[PDB]
DNA sequence: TATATTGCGCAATAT
DNA sequence: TATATTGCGCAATAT
């Protein structure tokens, strides 16, 4: 339209749209950051699992003969 | 509204834009799905770490004054 | 003469 | 009389 109330409401909506779009950009960046954090924690936990496995293999490899006197 | 070539170019761009925006929506869904998958794998790995801890503590808890005949 | 992506406004809709 | 979100077109830009 062309009324003065129309122009002010449009100006305000354009402001809100810019704000909402900027907020969505920040959310998407936060989602990317979360993917990186979970990937790092996944690699930490998997290395921890493997570490425990390697320490148990060495614990069983050398164990071979637990004394059986009789 | 410059020419007939203008109208066809705009029609083709509107098609491309709708396609591009749909592709972005599917990409964002893929990122959400990835977050869920990493979250599930992180819970599986943390449970595995805790299981290995519990099986080690109970192993050494029954371990007591293991023979030292001197 | 091609499609793909993106900042912006609009209008409809949602809160 | 409020802002927030979203489908769509436009024009500029990128590939």
Curated annotation (Swiss-Prot), chains A, B:
Residues 7-27 are annotated as: Basic motif. Induction: By ER stress. Changing residue 20 to A: Loss of nuclear translocation. It is found in: Nucleus; Cytoplasm. There is a cross-link at residue 64 (Glycyl lysine isopeptide (Lys-Gly) (interchain with G-Cter in SUMO2)). The modification Phosphoserine is found at residues 20, 57. Residues 3-66 form the bZIP domain. Residues 29-36 are annotated as: Leucine-zipper. It comes from the Eukaryota. Belongs to the bZIP family. C/EBP subfamily. Binds DNA as a homodimer and as a heterodimer. Interacts with ATF4. Binds DNA as a heterodimer with ATF4. Interacts with MYB; within the complex, MYB and CEBPB bind to different promoter regions. Can form stable heterodimers with CEBPD. Can form stable heterodimers with CEBPA and CEBPE. Interacts with SIX1. Isoform 2 and isoform 3 also form heterodimers. Interacts with TRIM28 and PTGES2. Interacts with PRDM16. Interacts with CCDC85B. Forms a complex with THOC5. Interacts with ZNF638; this interaction increases transcriptional activation. This is CCAAT/enhancer-binding protein beta. It comes from Homo sapiens (Human). The gene is CEBPB.
């Amino acid at each position: 339209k062309h009324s003065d109330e129309y122009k002010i409401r449009r100006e305000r909506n354009n402001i809100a749209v810019r704000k909402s779009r900027d907020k969505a950009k920040m959310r998407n960046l936060e989602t990317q950051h979360k993917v990186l954090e979970l990937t790092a924690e996944n690699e930490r936990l998997q290395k921890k699992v493997e570490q425990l496995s390697r320490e148990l293999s060495t614990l069983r490899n050398l164990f071979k003969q637990l004394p059986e006197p009789l």
